[PDB]
Amino acid sequence: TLVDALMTLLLANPRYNLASTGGHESDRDLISYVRGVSGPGDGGEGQSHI
Amino acid sequence: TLVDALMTLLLANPRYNLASTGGHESDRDLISYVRGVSGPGDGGEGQSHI
Amino acid sequence: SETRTLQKIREATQELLKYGLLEEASKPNLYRIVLSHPEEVTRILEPLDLDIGIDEIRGLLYVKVRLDETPAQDEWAHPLVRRQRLNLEQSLLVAILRQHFVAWEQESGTGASQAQIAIDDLLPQLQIYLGDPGSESKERTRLLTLLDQLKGHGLVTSPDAHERIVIRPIIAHLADPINLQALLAWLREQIAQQT
Amino acid sequence: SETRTLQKIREATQELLKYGLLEEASKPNLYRIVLSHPEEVTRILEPLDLDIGIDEIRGLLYVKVRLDETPAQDEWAHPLVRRQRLNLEQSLLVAILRQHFVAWEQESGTGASQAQIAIDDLLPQLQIYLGDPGSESKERTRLLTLLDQLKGHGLVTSPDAHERIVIRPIIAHLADPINLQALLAWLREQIAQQT
Amino acid sequence: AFTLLNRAAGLKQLNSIDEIFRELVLDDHSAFDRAAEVANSFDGLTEIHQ
C-alpha cells in the first residue's frame, strides 16, 4: 500500500497492488485506499469492510 | 525440472514450469527435458543449449 | 440465386490454395487486397480447417492448418494436407538454405532482399555430406533435380539464368528448424569424425 | 466472436473435396450431411468457383467447375482442378463405358452403382478402333493403361481379382446429352478438316 | 484430480474463483455430447423435410 502511495504521486495510471499477483492484475484501486478498505465485502455491505 | 518430471509421470498434459508464471502458463515441455534444453544458443547449429 | 464473392479475393484464394503462398513478389496487389480483407479469407478457409499465417515483414502470406487445441490424436490429421518426409538430400538442402536465410537476415536485417546463391558453391556443400555419385555432371544434374523438387514446394525459385537461385521467404516458417540444425551439425560433426 | 461452421459440415466438405466425388453406398454419413446443407456447402465452395451437382437416384455427389466472372472458359484451365484434361483416346473408351452403363441400368434399374463389365469384353471394341496389333500382351496392356488413366479421373474402379470392374456412376454426368453434343459437333468439325 | 494437483503446485493467484472451481476443481458432465445426440435424432426428420 505504501509503494502504491508513492506510485500514486508519480503515475497517471498507478496499477495498485500489481506486485501481489506478480504482473497479472492490479486489483486494488485508489478509492479503496482512500476508503481504507481492509478487504472485500466481509459479508455485509454497510461499509463494515471500510 | 524434478517437479515437471513428476507431473509428466502423473498427467497426460501438464503445465510444465508453471511456477515461474505464477499459475496461468507453461513454457517448457516434454521434449526439451528429454533433450536437456537449457537456452536458445545461437539457434542455427549450436548443440550446447541442447 | 446467391451472391458471388469478390472476384479478386476468389483469385487470391485459389492461387494461395494451389501454391500455399501469396507474396508481394508474385501477386502484390492480391497481397494488398487480402491484407485489407483477411476476415473474408479466413471465413472462406475455416470450413476446411484451413487458415493463413501471415508475414508482413517479408511480404509473405501462407497457409496453415487451423485445427483447434488438445486434439484426440496428439498431432493433427487433416483429410487434405498429406504429409511428406523428405529424403536426406532435400532435407539437407533445406537446412542449408534455412541457415542461409538466417545468415542473410543476420547480416542484412529482416526483409532485406536475398542475395543469390551459386550452384557453384552448392555442389561443394552437397559434396560436404554426400560424397560423389560418380561425376561432377551427376552432382550438378541431381542438384538441379532437387532444386526443381524444392521449387515444387515453392521454397526456392527456379534455377536462374546464371546458375544461382533465390530463397523463398516461406523458409522463414518451415515445420521445425530445430530438426534441420540438429541434423546439420550432426552431419558435419559425423563427417569430421569419420575423415 | 467466432462462428465456426458445423464441424460435421467441415468434415463432410473436406472429405468431398479430397475425393472430387462422394458415393452414398460407401460413405453415407458425409453424403447425407451435404444433402442436409447443400446451400452451405455451395456458399463454402463458391469462392473457389467449385459447385456441387447431385444424383439421388443413384447415390452420388460431386464437384464441377463454376463458369462465372470469366465466362465459360475451358473448365479444365482452372488452377484447382488437379488433373490433365480427358483426351479423345480416353473418350473412346468413355463412350463404350457409358453404353454399357446405360444398358445395364435399363435392365437392372438405377438402384445400384454396381454396373460391371469384364475387361476382355472391351478388347474387341477397342480392337476395331485401336486396331489389332495381334498380341494380347500389347492390347491388354494398353487397355489396362487406359483404364488406369480413367480411374485417375475416377470414372472406373481398377480391375478386381476376376478381371471385372465397376463403372462409377459419375460416368453418366460425364456422358451428358449436352456435352456429348458439343463433342459430336467438335468431332464432325475434326472430320471435316481431316478430309 | 491430477490436473488440479499439477496446477495446485503453483497457482497462487486464485485471481477469481469461478475458473478455479468450474474447471480445476469440479468434475465435468456437461451434456454437449448428449445435446448433440438429441439434435442428431432430428436430422432424420430434417432430411425428409429437405
Gap between the Cα atoms of D3 and C175, Å rounded: 28
Give the closest residue to B38 by CA, choosing from B10, B14, B12, B17: B17
Task: Tell me the nearest-neighbour CA distance from C108 into chain D, angstroms.
Answer: 36
Gap between the Cα atoms of C185 and B44, Å rounded: 9
* Residue numbers preceding breaks in chain E (C to N > 2.5 A): none
Gap between the Cα atoms of E46 and E50, Å rounded: 6
Give the strand pairing for D115-118 and D164-167: antiparallel
Asked if A41 has any chain E CB less than 8 Å from its own CB, the reply is no
Are D56 and D70 within 8 A, CB to CB? no
Name residue, grid cell 490424436. Answer: C73
Contacts of C91 by beta carbon, 8 Å cutoff, 6+ apart: C180, C183
Name residue, grid cell 542438384. Answer: C143
Asked if B37 has any chain E CB less than 8 Å from its own CB, the reply is no
Radius of gyration of chain D (CA): 19
Q: How many CB atoms lie within 10 A of CB D172?
A: 19
Q: Which three cell numbers stand for residue A49?
A: 469492510
Chain E residue with the nearest C-alpha to that of B6 = E6
Are C66 and C154 within 8 A, CB to CB? no
Contacts of D14 by beta carbon, 8 Å cutoff, 6+ apart: C47, C48, C49, C78, C79, C80
Are B42 and B32 within 8 A, CB to CB? no
Q: Do D15 and C48 touch (CB under 8 A)?
A: no
Cβ contacts below 8 Å, chain B against chain C, sum to: 17
Three-class SS of D28-43: HHHHHHHHHCHHHHHH
Which DSSP helix (H) or strand (E) runs through C51? Answer: strand C50-55
Name residue, grid cell 489396362. Answer: D144
Gap between the Cα atoms of C150 and C152, Å rounded: 5
Q: Which three cell numbers stand for residue C173?
A: 516458417
Task: Tell me the nearest-neighbour CA distance from B35 into chain E, angstroms.
Answer: 22
Task: Give me the DSSP letters along C14-33.
Answer: HHHHHHSEEETTTSHHHHHH
Q: How far is CA A32 from the centre of its chain?
A: 5
Secondary structure class of B27 (helix, strand, coil) = coil
Chain E residue with the nearest C-alpha to that of D7 = E36
Which DSSP helix (H) or strand (E) runs through D21? Answer: strand D21-23
Gap between the Cα atoms of A21 and A17, Å rounded: 8
Task: Tell me the nearest-neighbour CA distance from E40 into chain B, angstroms.
Answer: 31
Task: Tell me the nearest-neighbour CA distance from D188 into chain E, angstroms.
Answer: 44
Asked if A25 has any chain E CB less than 8 Å from its own CB, the reply is yes
Secondary structure class of C1 (helix, strand, coil) = coil
C60-65, strands of its sheet edge to edge: C21-23, C60-65, C50-55
Cβ-based contacts of A23 with chain B (< 8 Å): 22
Q: How many CB atoms lie within 10 A of CB C46?
A: 17
Secondary structure class of D116 (helix, strand, coil) = strand
Are C98 and C180 within 8 A, CB to CB? yes
Interface of E with D (CB under 8 A): 43, 46-47, 50
Cα dist from C53 to C15, C28, C109, D176, whole Å? 15, 16, 21, 42
| Residue D76 DSSP code | G
Gap between the Cα atoms of D60 and D27, Å rounded: 10
Three-class SS of A6-40: HHHHHCCCCCECHHHHCCCCCCECHHHHHHCCCCC
Cβ contacts below 8 Å, chain D against chain E, sum to: 8
Contacts of B22 by beta carbon, 8 Å cutoff, 6+ apart: A21, A22, A23, A24, E10, E11, E12, E13
Q: Do B45 and C184 touch (CB under 8 A)?
A: yes
Secondary structure class of C37 (helix, strand, coil) = coil
**Alpha-carbon dihedral sign for residues C59, C63, C64, C68:** positive
Q: Which three cell numbers stand for residue D63?
A: 464437384
Q: Do D35 and E47 touch (CB under 8 A)?
A: yes
Cβ contacts below 8 Å, chain B against chain E, sum to: 34
- The resolution, in angstroms to one decimal, equals 4.1
Asked if E5 has any chain B CB less than 8 Å from its own CB, the reply is yes
Task: Tell me the nearest-neighbour CA distance from B47 into chain C, angstroms.
Answer: 7
Are C169 and C59 within 8 A, CB to CB? yes
Give the closest residue to C163 by CA, choosing from C119, C122, C124, C133: C119
The burial of D44, by beta-carbon neighbours within 10 Å (0-12 exposed, 13-18 middle, 19 or more buried), is given as buried
Q: Which three cell numbers stand for residue D127?
A: 480392337
| Residue E21 DSSP code | I
Gap between the Cα atoms of B18 and B6, Å rounded: 13
Gap between the Cα atoms of C81 and C75, Å rounded: 13
Chain A residue with the nearest C-alpha to that of B19 = A22
Residues in chain E: 50
Secondary structure class of D22 (helix, strand, coil) = strand
Are B3 and B16 within 8 A, CB to CB? no
Q: Which three cell numbers stand for residue B7?
A: 507431473
Q: Do C5 and D44 touch (CB under 8 A)?
A: no
Are D48 and C18 within 8 A, CB to CB? no
> Partners for A (CB, 8 Å, 3+ pairs)?
B, E
Q: What are phi and psi of C54, to 5 degrees?
A: -125, 160
Are B48 and B41 within 8 A, CB to CB? yes
C35 Rama sector, left if φ>0, alpha if ψ -120 to 50, beta otherwise:
alpha
Q: Least CB-CB distance to D79: which of C7, C18, C49?
A: C18
Give the closest residue to D112 by CA, choosing from D183, D160, D55: D55
Gap between the Cα atoms of D94 and D116, Å rounded: 14
Gap between the Cα atoms of D132 and D148, Å rounded: 21
Q: How was this structure determined?
A: cryo-EM
Which DSSP helix (H) or strand (E) runs through C79? Answer: none
Direct distance between the N- and C-terminal alpha carbons of chain D, in angstroms, rounded to an integer: 67
Q: Which three cell numbers stand for residue D56?
A: 439421388
Are C61 and C73 within 8 A, CB to CB? no
Cβ-based contacts of A24 with chain E (< 8 Å): 13, 15
Gap between the Cα atoms of D123 and D134, Å rounded: 12
Chain D residue with the nearest C-alpha to that of C6 = D47
